[PDB]
Amino acid sequence: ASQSIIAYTMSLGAENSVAYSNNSIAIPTNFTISVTTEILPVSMTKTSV
Amino acid sequence: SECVLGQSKRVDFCGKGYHLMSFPQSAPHGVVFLHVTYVPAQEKNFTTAPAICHDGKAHFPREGVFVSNGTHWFVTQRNFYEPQIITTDNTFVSGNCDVVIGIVNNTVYDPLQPELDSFKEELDKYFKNHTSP
Amino acid sequence: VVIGIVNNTVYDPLQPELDSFKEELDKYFKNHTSP
Amino acid sequence: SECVLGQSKRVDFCGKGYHLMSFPQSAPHGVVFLHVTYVPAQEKNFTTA
Amino acid sequence: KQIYKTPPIKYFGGFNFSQILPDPSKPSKRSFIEDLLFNKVTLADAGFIKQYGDCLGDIAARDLICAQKFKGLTVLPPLLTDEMIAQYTSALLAGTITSGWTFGAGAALQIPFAMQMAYRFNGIGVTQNVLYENQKLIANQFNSAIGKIQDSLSSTASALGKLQDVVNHNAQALNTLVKQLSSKFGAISSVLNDI
Ligand SMILES: *[C@@H]1O[C@H](CO)[C@@H](O[C@@H]2O[C@H](CO)[C@@H](O[C@H]3O[C@H](CO)[C@@H](O)[C@H](O)[C@@H]3O)[C@H](O)[C@H]2NC(C)=O)[C@H](O)[C@H]1NC(C)=O
Ligand SMILES: *[C@@H]1O[C@H](CO)[C@@H](O[C@@H]2O[C@H](CO)[C@@H](O[C@H]3O[C@H](CO)[C@@H](O)[C@H](O)[C@@H]3O)[C@H](O)[C@H]2NC(C)=O)[C@H](O)[C@H]1NC(C)=O
Ligand SMILES: *[C@@H]1O[C@H](CO)[C@@H](O[C@@H]2O[C@H](CO)[C@@H](O[C@H]3O[C@H](CO)[C@@H](O)[C@H](O)[C@@H]3O)[C@H](O)[C@H]2NC(C)=O)[C@H](O)[C@H]1NC(C)=O
Ligand SMILES: *[C@@H]1O[C@H](CO[C@@H]2O[C@@H](C)[C@@H](O)[C@@H](O)[C@@H]2O)[C@@H](O[C@@H]2O[C@H](CO)[C@@H](O)[C@H](O)[C@H]2NC(C)=O)[C@H](O)[C@H]1NC(C)=O
Ligand SMILES: *[C@@H]1O[C@H](CO[C@@H]2O[C@@H](C)[C@@H](O)[C@@H](O)[C@@H]2O)[C@@H](O[C@@H]2O[C@H](CO)[C@@H](O)[C@H](O)[C@H]2NC(C)=O)[C@H](O)[C@H]1NC(C)=O
Ligand SMILES: *[C@@H]1O[C@H](CO)[C@@H](O[C@@H]2O[C@H](CO)[C@@H](O)[C@H](O)[C@H]2NC(C)=O)[C@H](O)[C@H]1NC(C)=O
Ligand SMILES: *[C@@H]1O[C@H](CO)[C@@H](O[C@@H]2O[C@H](CO)[C@@H](O)[C@H](O)[C@H]2NC(C)=O)[C@H](O)[C@H]1NC(C)=O
Ligand SMILES: *[C@@H]1O[C@H](CO)[C@@H](O)[C@H](O)[C@H]1NC(C)=O
Ligand SMILES: *[C@@H]1O[C@H](CO)[C@@H](O)[C@H](O)[C@H]1NC(C)=O
Ligand SMILES: *[C@@H]1O[C@H](CO)[C@@H](O)[C@H](O)[C@H]1NC(C)=O
């Protein structure tokens, strides 16, 4: 095997249909506390000429 | 203001999940937020109903939702499976069961009932022993 | 202490139970006066 | 994020009325949001205390 | 992150989403209200293959796009096609009507649509029995309001003026940037070979 440039139509996500019905519900029986980093600029360098 | 000094109900404003709290950390020219979020992880199917019919009267959850494991009916909170036995203190009444589409038949328990009934057995065992003189 | 408060009855849903339990009691007492 | 993936208590942000839900629709260079809002319609007077 | 889909049984407690959901029979997969919106904003091209074999000839005498191209002003295509954006919008819609908000927070969790609307009514401080006692009226009134929207977008173009004026501003800026080559800037000639 070897490496090269391929090209492809991009995938949007996994195809994932849902078990909907007019009398069924899914309820979570357990949970995960998650921690996620979000980063924002607040300043840039002050500059003079 | 809304993720560190507070708690946010704005969906995906303080990261994905439901917002618990967030911690600021400084970085060069910016800020990092460590958002903490509750994420509903493992799920199980249940049958469900909009209402219960009991005494012809239709019943709804005060808070939470109705579910069945297939043989018995429970109220449970919308975001986490903890089942409770369907009492008059879990639910409230309106109209009658002609009006609600998809309504189902189950008993609704009354926590006043054994507390008077066991007092009826006390009242009776005294009335009967009071026949002895 | 409340400005504009008004008089009306407030219903008690335990009251017709203990009233029905009074009539149930007194019918027993009438029964035990009977023989 | 706040009118499609949720329900928002924020006044006017998802149309006139109390917000229920909204549906996104795509357009050339844009998005169209069809917001559904609960609007009070036939009021009567009452005395209150 | 997932692409959700509507189930084969299109029933949602009497709510009629069929005007805003996809149509599997159509070659462009967009909704009926999307097919309205895509006729209401008229474009200064999408960068699609203006191949010389198209407009080396009479076309560029009456086509501002080939005239701009000969001056090196060109439009690049978007990375996401209008069918890709329809698939994302279809997933957001299928997520909403089948799963409520839970598809935002984590995995999608199915709920019956009339119980989703109840959860919502509690959200506006109206107690959930007021939905179920009126579910036929609420649905027929929603279905009527989605009707008003369709007819409103059938009647006029003027409402989409907010997306059209973005398209018109880029068209006007490039047509100006062409006209600016007419200027002499005080030189003997506008056209460079005449120097
Ligand atoms: C649905 O949830 C129900 C509650 O968890 C469950 O029913 C309960 O099952 C246990 C046994 O598995 C019963 O326990 C009793 O068993 C005998 C006979 O009654 C007694 O001798 C024992 O002392 C003990 O009390 C519970 O009483 C029973 N609850 C009810 C309301 O009857 C069902 O099994 C679950 N069904 C499914 C489909 O998962
Ligand atoms: C939920 O529980 C209800 C109470 O048991 C039950 O209602 C009962 O349904 C039967 C069948 O339709 C009715 O039977 C009578 O119907 C007519 C009179 O309307 C007569 O001509 C028949 O001979 C027969 O006697 C009961 O009268 C009716 N009772 C009430 C109070 O409405 C529902 O059917 C149950 N539903 C489910 C899905 O379990
Ligand atoms: C709401 O209900 C209250 C209870 O019935 C009622 O209060 C009662 O009002 C009368 C008249 O003001 C008082 O009568 C007394 O008035 C003075 C002393 O306060 C004396 O000159 C009289 O002889 C007499 O004793 C009651 O004492 C008073 N009771 C209480 C508990 O305050 C209100 O007036 C009612 N208000 C309305 C607007 O409905
Ligand atoms: C929840 O249930 C759905 C379907 O309901 C059940 O489907 C049967 C298998 C059986 O359990 C019946 O009592 C119910 O009617 C599940 O959906 C299925 O998912 C699998 C993949 O996991 C797929 O191959 C099937 O074709 C799906 N069928 C249907 C009807 O949806 C779903 O997986 C269940 N989820 C959980 C967490 O249990
Ligand atoms: C709510 O009531 C107000 C005024 O109170 C009423 O006044 C009398 C007419 C009598 O019916 C009382 O028992 C009521 O308490 C209404 O305001 C008036 O509306 C009329 C037209 O209907 C108008 O000519 C007056 O100018 C209005 N008065 C004021 C002070 O603006 C009001 O319209 C009622 N609301 C509804 C929904 O009917
Ligand atoms: C959902 O609403 C649409 C209209 O917005 C209904 O579609 C119309 O149905 C009638 C009767 O079959 C036709 O004459 C129209 O030409 C249809 N219009 C379109 C755009 O197809 C649709 O039937 C409704 N759904 C339900 C279940 O009633
Ligand atoms: C609430 O308002 C709606 C209209 O917005 C009323 O519904 C209409 O009622 C008339 C008779 O009064 C019917 O002819 C119409 O067909 C109904 N329209 C719909 C969409 O169903 C409704 O009656 C009002 N209800 C109350 C309690 O006032
Ligand atoms: C839902 O109920 C309707 C009738 O209101 C019925 O036609 C349909 O087959 C049911 N579907 C499911 C998946 O329960
Ligand atoms: C029966 O009544 C007598 C008094 O007459 C009392 O001593 C006895 O404890 C009573 N027993 C019961 C079971 O009520
Ligand atoms: C008193 O109660 C008995 C049952 O313990 C009942 O059979 C009888 O009819 C009652 N007596 C009268 C006079 O009602």
Side-chain angles (χ1 to χ4, degrees), chain E residues 36-48:
Chain E
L36 279 168
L37 295 162
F38 269 81
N39 290 4
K40 290 273 162 275
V41 178
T42 52
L43 288 160
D45 199 26
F48 292 2

Side-chain angles (χ1 to χ4, degrees), chain E residues 9-10 12 26 28-29 53 61-62 73 88 91 100-101 103 108 114 125 130 138 148 150 165 170 174 183 188:
Chain E
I9 184 168
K10 307 304 187 287
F12 305 97
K26 309 311 176 207
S28 48
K29 284 285 182 258
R62 63 179 183 270
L73 315 181
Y88 276 127
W101 46 66
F103 83 119
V130 183
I138 292 160
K148 296 279 288 291
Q150 196 271 86
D165 76 11
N170 167 266
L174 294 180
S183 316
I188 70 176

Side-chain angles (χ1 to χ4, degrees), chain E residues 108-126:
Chain E
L109 302 178
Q110 74 282 353
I111 184 169
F113 189 69
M115 300 192 69
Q116 156 164 195
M117 272 287 200
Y119 278 95
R120 294 182 178 269
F121 270 55
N122 293 324
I124 69 170
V126 173

Side-chain angles (χ1 to χ4, degrees), chain E residues 16 18-19 32:
Chain E
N16 182 2
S18 70
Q19 209 68 33
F32 190 107

